[PDB]
């Protein structure tokens, strides 16, 4: 027999990381992958996801074909597992990530990669800019405010103090880490879905700019 609960927990954590649904970062290992796959196999509920991932053992550079019922079942299973919302885009992201992991060899060191192979034609940032901007200009403003107005600043100093107390035990370091990684992962997902190369250089140039402004 197996500790299906522990297997499930490891599976959930690994799936979260490989679907970029959690900013949490931790070590992972072949033990964890095996936990995940065994849990999926044993669970009647998740047989479809098990089949999906098992198919990654092959060339894995392919788009699985599913009926609408199959896709709905898979999405329901994933959403029940992670308790969230989700998307077949996330399904494909997990498929690609797990395929890369399975195809990767056993190594003495962890492999750090970037999301890719999600949703054929490679598009540049410039082409995306042109097309998206044209479509946006086509779009019309859903709502607007008039000129001037006034920022609605709060006034209750006691209220501000209460909020300050409520937030004091929150570590700014952890909050900053979580926020930055959230933004980074969402940008990664957008790029991968768009099939446009992610400019790691410019993404880091953002922080370079932050530092260059700070130093002055």
């Amino acid at each position: 027999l197996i500790n299906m609960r522990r297997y499930r927990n490891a599976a959930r954590k690994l799936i979260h990381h490989y679907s970029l649904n959690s900013t949490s970062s931790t070590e992972y290992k072949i033990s964890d992958v095996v936990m995940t796959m065994i849990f999926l196999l044993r669970s009647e509920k998740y047989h479809s996801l098990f089949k999906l991932l098992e198919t990654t053992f092959d060339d894995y550079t392919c788009r699985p074909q599913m009926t609408q019922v199959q896709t709905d079942t898979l999405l329901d299973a994933v959403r029940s597992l992670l308790e969230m919302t989700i998307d077949l885009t996330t399904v494909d992201i997990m498929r690609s990530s797990f395929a890369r992991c399975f195809n990767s060899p056993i190594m003495r060191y962890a492999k750090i990669v970037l999301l890719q192979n999600v949703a054929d034609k490679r598009t540049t940032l410039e082409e995306l800019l042109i097309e998206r901007g044209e479509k946006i200009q086509m779009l019309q403003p859903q709502q607007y405010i008039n000129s001037g107005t006034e920022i609605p600043f709060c006034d209750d100093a006691e209220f501000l103090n209460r909020l300050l107390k409520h937030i004091d035990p929150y570590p700014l370091s952890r909050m900053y880490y979580n926020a930055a990684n959230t933004m980074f992962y969402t940008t990664m997902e957008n790029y991968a879905v768009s099939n446009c190369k992610f400019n790691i250089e410019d993404y880091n140039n953002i922080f370079k700019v932050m530092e260059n402004i700070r130093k002055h």
Partner: protein, 246 residues
């Protein structure tokens, strides 16, 4: 490094020499600066939360952004954040002058990766484009409320010197959500500032490469304006060099 002092009486030659290691004062200064910066940032975050409350929207932030129908509240929140950042850079400004338009995209072919909030004029007035799906995705991504983030000698010294102390729906998760929204709107505001003050071509070039931000902003930001929120920490991509080589 170190210093030393000598005491001596005018009429006598018996002098007493003492030596001081500046590391202690360095620790004092670093702790003071860290505490001051933490207090400033928490004050700003609390102020942002408080003004959003002043708007008096019943739902919480994430629910607001999930409710696709109520574009009114999305626009209100976005504009309020943008104006707050604008004032934080120009404290004397409490409005935004020119009226503002808003649109909430709903599709990938309508959204631009890496710039969920952007700006474009209709040749008469500026329109702000919002990627509500992306905002929802960011604010919904599960956050880590457990792991910690980070010279061992000064680390130990701070550990042993500094002390610790053992009805709002806000948890660290919601605080993180607010901070993420603020940072995103700050990025968008920097883009918009470069746009307004350097032309649409410069705005497009910045979108292509943010590096121009360095000069186009530090010319005015680092001197007259409160430092960027991100300035609180130095950020970096894990395994950046190998990733670049990839």
């Amino acid at each position: 490094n170190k210093v030393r002092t000598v005491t001596e009486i005018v009429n006598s030659d018996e002098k007493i020499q003492k030596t001081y290691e500046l590391a202690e004062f360095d620790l004092k200064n670093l702790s003071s600066l860290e505490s001051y910066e933490t207090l400033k940032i928490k004050l700003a975050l609390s102020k942002y939360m408080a003004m959003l409350s002043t708007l008096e929207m019943t739902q919480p932030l994430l629910e607001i952004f999930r409710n696709k129908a109520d574009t009114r509240q999305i626009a209100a929140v976005v504009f309020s954040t943008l104006a707050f950042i604008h004032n934080r850079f120009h404290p004397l400004v409490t409005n935004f002058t020119n009226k503002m338009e808003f649109v909430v995209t709903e599709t990938n072919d309508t959204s631009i990766p890496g710039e969920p909030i952007l700006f474009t004029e209709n040749e008469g007035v500026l329109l702000c484009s919002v990627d509500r799906p992306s905002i929802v995705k960011m604010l919904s991504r599960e956050f880590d409320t457990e792991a910690l983030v980070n010279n061992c000698n000064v680390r130990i010294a701070k550990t042993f010197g500094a002390s610790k102390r053992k009805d709002f729906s806000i948890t660290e998760v919601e605080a993180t959500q607010y901070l993420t929204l603020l940072l995103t709107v700050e990025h968008a505001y920097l883009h918009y500032y470069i746009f307004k003050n350097y032309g649409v071509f410069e705005y497009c070039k910045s979108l292509t490469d943010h590096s121009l931000f360095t000069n186009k902003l530090r010319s005015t930001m680092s001197t007259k304006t409160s430092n960027l929120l991100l300035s609180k920490f130095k950020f970096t991509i894990e395994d950046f060099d190998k990733i670049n080589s990839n």
